[PDB]
Amino acid sequence: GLVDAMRGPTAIANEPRAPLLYPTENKMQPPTIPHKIDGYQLDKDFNRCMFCHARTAIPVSITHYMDRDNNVLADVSPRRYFCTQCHVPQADTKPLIGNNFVDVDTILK
Amino acid sequence: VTDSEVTKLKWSKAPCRFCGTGCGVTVAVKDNKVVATQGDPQAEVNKGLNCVKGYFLSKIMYGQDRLTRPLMRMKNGKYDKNGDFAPVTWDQAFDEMERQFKRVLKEKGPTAVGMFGSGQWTVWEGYAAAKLYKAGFRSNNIDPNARHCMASAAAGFMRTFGMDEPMGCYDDFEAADAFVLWGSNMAEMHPILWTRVTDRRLSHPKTRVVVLSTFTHRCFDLADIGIIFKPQTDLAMLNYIANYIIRNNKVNKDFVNKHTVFKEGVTDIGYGLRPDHPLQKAAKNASDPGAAKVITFDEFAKFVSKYDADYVSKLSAVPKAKLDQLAELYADPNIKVMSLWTMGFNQHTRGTWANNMVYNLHLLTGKIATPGNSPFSLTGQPSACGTAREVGTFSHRLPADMVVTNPKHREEAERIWKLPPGTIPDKPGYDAVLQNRMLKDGKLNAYWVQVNNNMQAAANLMEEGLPGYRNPANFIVVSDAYPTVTALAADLVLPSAMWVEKEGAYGNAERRTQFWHQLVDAPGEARSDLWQLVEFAKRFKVEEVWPPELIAKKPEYKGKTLYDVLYRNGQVDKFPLKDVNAEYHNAEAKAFGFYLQKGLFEEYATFGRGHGHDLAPFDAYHEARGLRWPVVNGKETRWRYREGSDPYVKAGTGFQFYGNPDGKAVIFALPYEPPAESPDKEYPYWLVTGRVLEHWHSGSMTRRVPELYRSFPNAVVFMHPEDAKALGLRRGVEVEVVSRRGRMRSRIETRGRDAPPRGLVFVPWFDASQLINKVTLDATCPISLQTDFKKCAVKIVKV
Ligand SMILES: Nc1nc2c(c(=O)[nH]1)N[C@H]1C(S)=C(S)[C@@H](COP(=O)(O)OP(=O)(O)OC[C@H]3O[C@@H](n4cnc5c(=O)[nH]c(N)nc54)[C@H](O)[C@@H]3O)O[C@H]1N2
Ligand SMILES: Nc1nc2c(c(=O)[nH]1)N[C@H]1C(S)=C(S)[C@@H](COP(=O)(O)OP(=O)(O)OC[C@H]3O[C@@H](n4cnc5c(=O)[nH]c(N)nc54)[C@H](O)[C@@H]3O)O[C@H]1N2
Ligand code: HEC
Numbered sequence A: 001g002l003v004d005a006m007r008g009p010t011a012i013a014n015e016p017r018a019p020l021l022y023p024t025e026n027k028m029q030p031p032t033i034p035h036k037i038d039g040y041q042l043d044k045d046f047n048r049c050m051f052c053h054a055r056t057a058i059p060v061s062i063t064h065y066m067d068r069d070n071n072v073l074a075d076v077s078p079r080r081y082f083c084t085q086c087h088v089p090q091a092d093t094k095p096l097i098g099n100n101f102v103d104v105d106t107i108l109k
Numbered sequence B: 001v002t003d004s005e006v007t008k009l010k011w012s013k014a015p016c017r018f019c020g021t022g023c024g025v026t027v028a029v030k031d032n033k034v035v036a037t038q039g040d041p042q043a044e045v046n047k048g049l050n051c052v053k054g055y056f057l058s059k060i061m062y063g064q065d066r067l068t069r070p071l072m073r074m075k076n077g078k079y080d081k082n083g084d085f086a087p088v089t090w091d092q093a094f095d096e097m098e099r100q101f102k103r104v105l106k107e108k109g110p111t112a113v114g115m116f117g118s119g120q121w122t123v124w125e126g127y128a129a130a131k132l133y134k135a136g137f138r139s140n141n142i143d144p145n146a147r148h149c150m151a152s153a154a155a156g157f158m159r160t161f162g163m164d165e166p167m168g169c170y171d172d173f174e175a176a177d178a179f180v181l182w183g184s185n186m187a188e189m190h191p192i193l194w195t196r197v198t199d200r201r202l203s204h205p206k207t208r209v210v211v212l213s214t215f216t217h218r219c220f221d222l223a224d225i226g227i228i229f230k231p232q233t234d235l236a237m238l239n240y241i242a243n244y245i246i247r248n249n250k251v252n253k254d255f256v257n258k259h260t261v262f263k264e265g266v267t268d269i270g271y272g273l274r275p276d277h278p279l280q281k282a283a284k285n286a287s288d289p290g291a292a293k294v295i296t297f298d299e300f301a302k303f304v305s306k307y308d309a310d311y312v313s314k315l316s317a318v319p320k321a322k323l324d325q326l327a328e329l330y331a332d333p334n335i336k337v338m339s340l341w342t343m344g345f346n347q348h349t350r351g352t353w354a355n356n357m358v359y360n361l362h363l364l365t366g367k368i369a370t371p372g373n374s375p376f377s378l379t380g381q382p383s384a385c386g387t388a389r390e391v392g393t394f395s396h397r398l399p400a401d402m403v404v405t406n407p408k409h410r411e412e413a414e415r416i417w418k419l420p421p422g423t424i425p426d427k428p429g430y431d432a433v434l435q436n437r438m439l440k441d442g443k444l445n446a447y448w449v450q451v452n453n454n455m456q457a458a459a460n461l462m463e464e465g466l467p468g469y470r471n472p473a474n475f476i477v478v479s480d481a482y483p484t485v486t487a488l489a490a491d492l493v494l495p496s497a498m499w500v501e502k503e504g505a506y507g508n509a510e511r512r513t514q515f516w517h518q519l520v521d522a523p524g525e526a527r528s529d530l531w532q533l534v535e536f537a538k539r540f541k542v543e544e545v546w547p548p549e550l551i552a553k554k555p556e557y558k559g560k561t562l563y564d565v566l567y568r569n570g571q572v573d574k575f576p577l578k579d580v581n582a583e584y585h586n587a588e589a590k591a592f593g594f595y596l597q598k599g600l601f602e603e604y605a606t607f608g609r610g611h612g613h614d615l616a617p618f619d620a621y622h623e624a625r626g627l628r629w630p631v632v633n634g635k636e637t638r639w640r641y642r643e644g645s646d647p648y649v650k651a652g653t654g655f656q657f658y659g660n661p662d663g664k665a666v667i668f669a670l671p672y673e674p675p676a677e678s679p680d681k682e683y684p685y686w687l688v689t690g691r692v693l694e695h696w697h698s699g700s701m702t703r704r705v706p707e708l709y710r711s712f713p714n715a716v717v718f719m720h721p722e723d724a725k726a727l728g729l730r731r732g733v734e735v736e737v738v739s740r741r742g743r744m745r746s747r748i749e750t751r752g753r754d755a756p757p758r759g760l761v762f763v764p765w766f767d768a769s770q771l772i773n774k775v776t777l778d779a780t781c782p783i784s785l786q787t788d789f790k791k792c793a794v795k796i797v798k799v
């Protein structure tokens, strides 16, 4: 009369077979990344994301070129430089449990 | 949030539900649903930004399997340890908890009841629970998940400074010239503080970022100097830098002479294992492991002189040139240094000593309590500081740094709680590790877990936790918002209201206490942990829980319940329902008939006011985006112990470490000692465990969010490619990770974000289908009793 869908049916004392390592899907919130990012350098010497998403792929929005005082700068702000703190790719797999979240557009119509 | 009269959404402020950074968010509600959150532009911590977890806060309360009804193991119509769970009413759940706790209190007494709480409790939840156990049941068996986390930091603070929590603040990130990460993975674990380090480094490029770790991770993508070192050798590296400072004549003579003293601690102190473990039988000084003697500066310098470059480089595997680059940043009096550490120092069988030893570096050079010169221990949970440490929800503690062993501290708590003298137990109870051992041994028999998943989180699941929870001598109650493995190992599961389904307060890593209002109603019959503790207290009269000679001291309490004594005591109930802001619900104030959270907070705040821990008036926190304590005359304090910034520091002194009676901070001579369990020929790998950016802890909230689950579905074994080749493994192949205690199964990742040296693997612990704490050892720092989850020895076997 209780199951944890994060674990699956396996008793605590036993070890399940690990699911396969799923490939990444090539397809208010930060959009998720609809492509693989495994060969993409992101370090202080080179930001490969900016090769396709710089304001000069849809470009990063103007908020990404703003400093903590909201001044707009000529290049991406250090405060958004490490893109993967906020944007994540998605495994090509279904979620484990339903989630009843409702977004703004839905709640308003 | 917004002045507007035309939004259809109601936006309100709250702190993030996740890490100790404590970002402020704004939360949008319509028709009882949180439909969006955003980084709060007005919050100073984060100034509008969040990491991916804070951006998906709108989804964490809405997993389809939220708990909605109490569930009790039953067979043939009654409670049964072997039955499967069945829905019962709140009154039935409490009737059973009442019978079980009363039976145990009568037969065994208060050492046989306990609670395992949380740095995710709200301040008033922690305070209400501390009262229920220490003053009500008269049991010091209340400890929190934060024992696994910040107890080495807290022990380090009390030993060096005589008072807990950092003396710098986040403003130091904009002033430092060098950041030194001592194993912290801030990029994933304190992402918005890593944004502030990144802004400082990229905008002021003379700044240096030095990252020390036992494997390479995303902080290395900003590092000027990356150092991979052998587990536990940080103790030797810390002494090497102290020795370098002295050898190069860079001691701040004025600061050291005015403001420090020196001690040498006892050594060979064991590993916090059971007393019959060979490591405990062998240890000379396990019975008083924090003992120290006063020494001179000259003895300190002789002590650290043994940590010379040849010995430290060979022990740590770090080249001498990098040791010197790092020590030079410490030594140069014109470089402001912010040192940062997290579980690499605290989850360490000599973690209290490592805390002391990193303070030594700042104290030798006087780099402390001023902007940018900051030894800054990072806190993990959203309220390990505000709740567990400040309220004192630990087996040895009372509020505001006090300890149950000090009879003046017990007298102060008895005065404020209006208890008869001798109510509060004078001996420390069972701390986290010892609670699982006592459950296994049948000595802890009525147990209530709230806001944690300790079956997944505690080390050595197969040998201690699991046998302990399933022991038929024990009755285990778990309050959770979701099914977890801890609830599956329990006997009674209580559905709990979470985050903005209740009015709350959390205190982050820089002493910022942040409130929120209850913005929505919980589903089904779920109710706050606060409501549950206070409601349960009604079931006990003082005659049932206090001895006659205690009651004789306060005969006005004859016949009253713990609810009367603890919560309806003229203080906790002194703010009426009219004080409740009518714009928000307040489920507990309605249930009990007065402003319970405000009364708890104001009674609790009496401990710290005027005693160095001052909290502002309750209402001020509903107005602000947090205020950093001590709040004195309505002004928050940014740098503690520094004249002109901290109003408790005496004029003319420059600094005063007033937690200590002489006003001086202590510099400790302490050695390198090896881990409890290192690799050998049978178990040739180091196992290191920890987290990834996208999941929180056991994953019960983040792995129920579609986007976070899809971003990182399962734990993996991060392995060096040549180690995999040597075991005949490819990426994606299944292995068992096996220690002397247990095993788990998982797939190899050889090209992921965490890239360990040969001989070492890293496994994150968020996957409830991959219980890595079956493999870890419950060895602890003997002083703080904090578990070392970061190293033990494993074999990796191809499945
Ligand atoms: N994304 C995310 N963020 C979180 C959390 C979460 O669950 N998810 N939880 C929060 C909590 S409560 C905590 S406590 C923090 C934990 O934050 P961290 O401690 O930064 O992270 P972990 O992944 O637990 O620990 C991995 C680190 O341990 C260091 N390490 C291992 N062995 C040694 C050693 O011998 N010495 C030293 N000095 N370092 C060592 C490694 O180098 C590695 O960088 O994260 C907090 N923030
Ligand atoms: N191997 C290994 N183990 C570790 C660590 C490690 O690095 N490695 N880190 C250690 C550390 S530092 C820590 S902090 C601990 C953290 O370990 P825990 O605190 O045990 O893990 P969480 O998943 O944060 O547990 C919080 C629980 O609260 C539940 N829930 C959420 N909101 C509410 C609420 O308002 N009320 C109630 N009653 N339940 C609620 C969640 O569903 C979840 O089950 O783990 C420790 N364990
Ligand atoms: C070209 C070789 C790219 C590199 C390098 C990166 N991205 Fe990308 N991205 C690219 C395309 C062609 C697309 C689809 C078009 C689109 O913009 O949708 C994307 C998409 C994204 C998105 C979604 C944006 C949105 O539609 O709202 C994000 C958030 C994203 N990409 C992020 C991102 C990151 C962080 C990168 C480095 C790790 C990265 N991209 C590299 C093309 C290319």
Ligand code: HEC
Binding pocket: A028, A029, A030, A031, A047, A049, A050, A053, A058, A059, A060, A061, A063, A064, A076, A079, A080, A081, A082, A083, A084, A085, A086, A087, B049, B050, B051
């Ligand atoms: C959180 C602090 C972020 C960081 C770091 C990065 N981005 Fe971002 N991004 C974030 C948000 C909340 C949003 C949606 C709101 C908005 O600003 O538009 C975005 C949006 C994008 C987009 C879509 C832009 C659009 O026109 O719709 C892209 C393509 C994008 N972000 C890419 C991106 C890159 C490449 C990053 C590193 C250089 C980066 N983002 C960092 C939040 C955050």
Ligand code: SF4
Binding pocket: B016, B017, B018, B019, B020, B021, B022, B023, B046, B049, B050, B051, B052, B053, B054, B055, B190, B191, B192, B193
């Ligand atoms: S950095 Fe921490 S507090 Fe901030 S949004 Fe992320 S999880 Fe929340």
